[PDB]
Symmetry: C2
């Protein structure tokens, strides 16, 4: 099925939001397929956010993502990308709906808790960038109860 790249940002790790974030994805029915703790490298962040290279404060946005360990994941399932974006909420947590990850826990645009892919093309690039080309297939153990 479709897959998406979900990364818990360094400050959300430090706020101990890991279980609360994973609950949203796991209760929605998506399948965890990969997981990795990483201290992000500057070069990898610049590639991840290459579409942002022209924007004001690009350097600061990269620096913020370098301040500590992230939890990088792949979640799989029907409409995974759109589903993840909806669970996460608007870029700016003030605009995100209550009940979303950013709406419930987030305060600023720079520390907005989590990254999720915005489209299938970017998900594939991000997965290969952060995780690798050999993410192994997982069993859709309860597919019949969800679809």
């Amino acid at each position: 099925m479709e897959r998406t790249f979900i990364m818990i940002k360094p400050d959300a790790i430090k706020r101990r939001l890991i279980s609360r974030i994973i609950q949203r994805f796991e209760e929605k029915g998506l399948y965890l397929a990969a997981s990795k703790c990483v201290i992000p490298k500057r070069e990898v962040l610049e590639t991840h956010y290459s579409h942002l290279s022209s924007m004001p404060f690009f350097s600061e946005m990269v620096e913020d993502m370098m301040s500590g360990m992230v939890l990088a994941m792949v979640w799989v399932g029907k409409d995974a990308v759109s589903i993840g974006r909806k669970l996460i909420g608007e870029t700016n947590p003030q605009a995100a709906s209550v009940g979303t990850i950013r709406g419930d826990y987030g305060v600023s645009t720079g520390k907005n808790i989590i990254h999720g892919s915005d489209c299938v093309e970017n998900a594939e690039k991000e997965i290969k960038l952060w995780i690798g080309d050999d993410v192994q297939p997982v069993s859709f153990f309860d597919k019949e109860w969800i679809y």
Copy 2:
């Protein structure tokens, strides 16, 4: 600080217990240092359970442990091995105290949710077997409030 190896067994993944399990460790104050999604290989399992190789249930245990993805983790902190053991509870879920992972979620000894290292010696052996030689130092971000 001390490290322990914590692995969510495949049936617990299928029961969607990931967030509830991580919650116990995260709220207790231990630090996540490594995370990997793995479909276990036979030779790995045969090494890990080498002390059980004469038992009549051995092949079944290996098959069950190969029946899906496991989530393998390292958690770090003062007394992390003993702390993880207590959070998890006794091997037989019917002997485990209510409030433990096994006591709250587990019914049978075979499908007892999770594995955690029994001592520091085994934790080190287990991390090297399942994760690798190079787990990076973790930032103890809220150490002064806990330890």
